[PDB]
Design a protein around this ligand. Sequence first.
Ligand code: FAD
Ligand code: FAD
Ligand code: IND
Ligand code: IND
Ligand code: IND
Ligand code: IND
Ligand code: IND
Ligand code: IND
Ligand code: IND
Ligand code: IND
Ligand code: IND
Ligand code: IND
Ligand code: IND
Ligand code: IND
Ligand code: IND
Ligand code: IND
Ligand code: NA
Ligand code: NA
Lengths: 413, 413
Amino acid sequence: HMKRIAIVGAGQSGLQLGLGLLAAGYEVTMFSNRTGEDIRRGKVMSSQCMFDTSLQIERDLGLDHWASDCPTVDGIGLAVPHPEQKGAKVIDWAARLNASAQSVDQRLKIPAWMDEFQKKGGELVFKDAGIDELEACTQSHDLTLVASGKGEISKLFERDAHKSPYDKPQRALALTYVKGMAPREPFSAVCFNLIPGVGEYFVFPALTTTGPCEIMVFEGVPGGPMDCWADVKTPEEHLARSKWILDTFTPWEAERCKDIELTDDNGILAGRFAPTVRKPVATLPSGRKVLGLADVVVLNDPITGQGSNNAAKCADTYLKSILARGDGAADAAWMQQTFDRYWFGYAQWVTQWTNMLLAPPPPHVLNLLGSAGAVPPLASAFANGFDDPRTFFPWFADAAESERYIATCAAVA
Amino acid sequence: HMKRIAIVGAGQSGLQLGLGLLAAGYEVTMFSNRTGEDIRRGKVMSSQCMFDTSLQIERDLGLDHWASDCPTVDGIGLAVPHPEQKGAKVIDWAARLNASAQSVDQRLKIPAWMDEFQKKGGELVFKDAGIDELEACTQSHDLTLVASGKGEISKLFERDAHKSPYDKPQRALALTYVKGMAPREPFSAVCFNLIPGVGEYFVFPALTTTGPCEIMVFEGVPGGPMDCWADVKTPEEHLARSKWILDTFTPWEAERCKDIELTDDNGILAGRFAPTVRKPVATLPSGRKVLGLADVVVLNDPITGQGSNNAAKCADTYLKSILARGDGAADAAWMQQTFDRYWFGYAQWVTQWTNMLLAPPPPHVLNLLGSAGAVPPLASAFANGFDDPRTFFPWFADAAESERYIATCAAVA
Ligand SMILES: Cc1cc2nc3c(=O)[nH]c(=O)nc-3n(C[C@H](O)[C@H](O)[C@H](O)COP(=O)(O)OP(=O)(O)OC[C@H]3O[C@@H](n4cnc5c(N)ncnc54)[C@H](O)[C@@H]3O)c2cc1C
Ligand SMILES: Cc1cc2nc3c(=O)[nH]c(=O)nc-3n(C[C@H](O)[C@H](O)[C@H](O)COP(=O)(O)OP(=O)(O)OC[C@H]3O[C@@H](n4cnc5c(N)ncnc54)[C@H](O)[C@@H]3O)c2cc1C
Ligand SMILES: c1ccc2[nH]ccc2c1
Ligand SMILES: c1ccc2[nH]ccc2c1
Ligand SMILES: c1ccc2[nH]ccc2c1
Ligand SMILES: c1ccc2[nH]ccc2c1
Ligand SMILES: c1ccc2[nH]ccc2c1
Ligand SMILES: c1ccc2[nH]ccc2c1
Ligand SMILES: c1ccc2[nH]ccc2c1
Ligand SMILES: c1ccc2[nH]ccc2c1
Ligand SMILES: c1ccc2[nH]ccc2c1
Ligand SMILES: c1ccc2[nH]ccc2c1
Ligand SMILES: c1ccc2[nH]ccc2c1
Ligand SMILES: c1ccc2[nH]ccc2c1
Ligand SMILES: c1ccc2[nH]ccc2c1
Ligand SMILES: c1ccc2[nH]ccc2c1
Ligand code: NA
Ligand code: NA
């Protein structure tokens, strides 16, 4: 009678997909390796800035439960320190987003969606799932998906070397969730601070388990002055190192932080990983097959702020493919084509752009970013491209095309 | 109080946009150069095969008025004549679409949407609009759009030479709407017949003013054996020349046509045009500005079946941009950014792919099309790519990437 879907991994993409499937009349089994409460009170996992298109995917499913309470992010700003004048910027501009972005802590969203999943009839099973659970799921369900993010079981899927130009981390990452930051005026924004040869500091308002906050995101070229977390062993030390980066590299941002505190002692993170794309179909010892979802198959560095946007868009594409398939077999071909539509239609572009941004920038890029400060339509294109990075091609990557786009923008300024 | 939008040109994109704007509470003025009835009873304009994503845009607006009555197109087929054996094919395969396509004659859809537009409160003005009407609209409306398709006033917009690699027609076109064709079994499809060095014949079921039909689409390399319409001066002669092409080049299709008749004497068309992209902002003598929509700014050869899909997607992107803008100015910068989002996010890919397909194919393409006949997942990717041609990049265009995609497909077959 009823089609039955198993999802291993209770994360953003898995739960969005599972909730959509329940609403469409499927039976859904989901495995989680943590309780909701331990997720709420555990370490942060991301900075999860979702732009309008991803937000709308959630709205269309009825899952925008924090829309009113979560602060809106209304623009993007970009600043570059002056090579000469201390504490001055040589580039400093901003542009409004055509529609707001929002960052709802996954510590809030994932547990609440787990609650909703059970209320809507999903079967939530608690276990650190392994091969045995995948073998069991594939015998009792029409389709089994792995949605375990950066978890170890994700390595069941073969690395796709041609889609993975990097095999090492390209940035040392850290997150710091704080209260008390002076609000940005006259509108909120993701404040991008690009430190040439050193790294990046991004900061924006968000909602966490103690209410509204701002999230500080730090990325450092490995071995550089912002690869600076190895000796940090306490929350107090993490807050202090966060303020040290701002004092040292972005004193204009330190002026907003004279009174910041951590939201909670678990509102901190540091780590690193190599960008990786994996093949989406994994074969179990039995010969049965499972399909990878979102970060299991496409894992990008957070520098472009796309992971949670990718997660929403991936789960949307997979849900649409399931609903269209009907009673057709969920075989390896269908699985692969489902991933291919996500990859070739969308994620290949997000991934190529993110991987290029991790490398040292060519000269036409500096000209582009500086020109944006004098050409508001170009600044606007930069800001709104974060909602659909396909719109950056080819002009972000090619000098001649970048000059042509600057000219188009200047002509309507 | 109310924002007011003028649209010059009562075509598919203009009417979809106008109806969406009325539903959102805007005042809309629209200019048409023909009455609804003369459109219904006049010459056909297109073959308007719309794939699922475009169909869903219409559904989401409540405009899928023919969904139940229009025959569904459930797949794509590809056939290539054998160079040796007479009347045989060396390639002949098909694949199912993940969701049906539909072709509702614009002679039906445009007049019915004009009726709906008036019923929903739009102001429909009948005049062959010129500069004077654009000058008048721009004084009395917040935003004026030109949606006149292949009409002469579209030339108010400057040709974009960098986005327009062609300045001459690349195919001699013809359309023939017929009754009596044997239905394709066991499922309907767009039957692609590629005649190397000569042209293309496509055929699929559709709905017109006399009910269900099939549409024959002919494209001929200029000066070749299928550039064969210049001496056709009557409907009877047009039907006969249509059957001659099938008898001569695709006798397997002629077997379905032993009993075909025209749906009506105006169910025929022949012509040609150069693919053209235009700059989207036009400046009137007064200095006020107007924004071009759909075929006014991006006009592709029909060979890839995308014009009406582009029209729906363009009007969707423009409607979303208007709704997000609120009371912000509809200035040249906003106009340009609205087009840019359509172009860089979507249409640049449809356009580049369509323009490459008009040129003689490189060897890796023949290998790809032949391999699809032995690799069903690749045939499926080919078919479903017509719903989002971004999914064809880069593997349709690059030999090495084409070989990699064939390998991915063969591994899950
Ligand atoms: C520092 C940092 C900052 C980021 N900032 C942003 C940002 O600003 N914007 C943005 O869009 N993205 C951002 N991201 C990325 C984004 O958070 C992720 O890409 C997103 O969470 C991916 O969703 P997912 O559903 O694939 O995985 P997740 O949401 O991580 O879900 C995976 C879940 O599976 C569980 N799991 C693992 N193994 C198992 C197992 N064996 N059995 C059962 N369950 C298991 C895990 O516990 C976890 O809860 C950031 C990431 C990092 C690291
Ligand atoms: C032979 C052929 C086959 C095709 N087959 C397909 C297919 O299979 N699939 C597909 O998706 N697309 C196909 N197309 C393309 C598709 O039909 C068009 O791209 C689509 O109609 C574009 O919509 P539009 O709204 O931009 O223009 P239209 O829908 O053409 O609307 C333009 C309207 O503006 C009116 N107008 C012109 N000048 C003025 C003026 N001065 N004042 C007022 N009104 C004016 C015109 O009379 C017309 O009604 C085909 C095209 C051709 C020529
Ligand atoms: C170019 C522009 C700005 C810069 N700040 C520090 C180095 C450097 C180089
Ligand atoms: C190790 C790594 C990074 C650092 N930045 C400043 C001091 C320092 C030490
Ligand atoms: C939005 C945009 C870019 C970003 N980089 C890191 C976090 C983040 C959020
Ligand atoms: C994806 C594809 C086909 C399917 N048949 C039953 C469930 C299911 C999921
Ligand atoms: C966002 C993130 C990193 C970047 N490096 C250069 C531009 C840029 C934008
Ligand atoms: C193109 C290539 C490499 C790059 N690194 C940062 C921006 C950028 C653009
Ligand atoms: C992020 C977004 C767009 C961009 N264009 C050039 C560099 C770059 C970085
Ligand atoms: C290659 C394949 C098929 C063909 N039919 C006619 C010429 C030709 C060339
Ligand atoms: C002119 C053009 C094309 C043609 N195909 C067959 C005869 C003929 C004449
Ligand atoms: C669908 C797909 C391709 C096509 N080429 C011409 C008409 C047509 C319809
Ligand atoms: C597009 C953009 C801004 C606008 N303000 C009023 C109407 C309108 C349309
Ligand atoms: C559709 C239309 C034209 C084409 N030429 C080669 C492949 C192909 C597909
Ligand atoms: C790449 C380049 C040119 C082409 N002509 C027909 C198919 C095709 C693909
Ligand atoms: C149409 C669609 C996809 C394609 N891949 C190679 C040629 C070609 C034509
Ligand atoms: Na300043
Ligand atoms: Na046959």
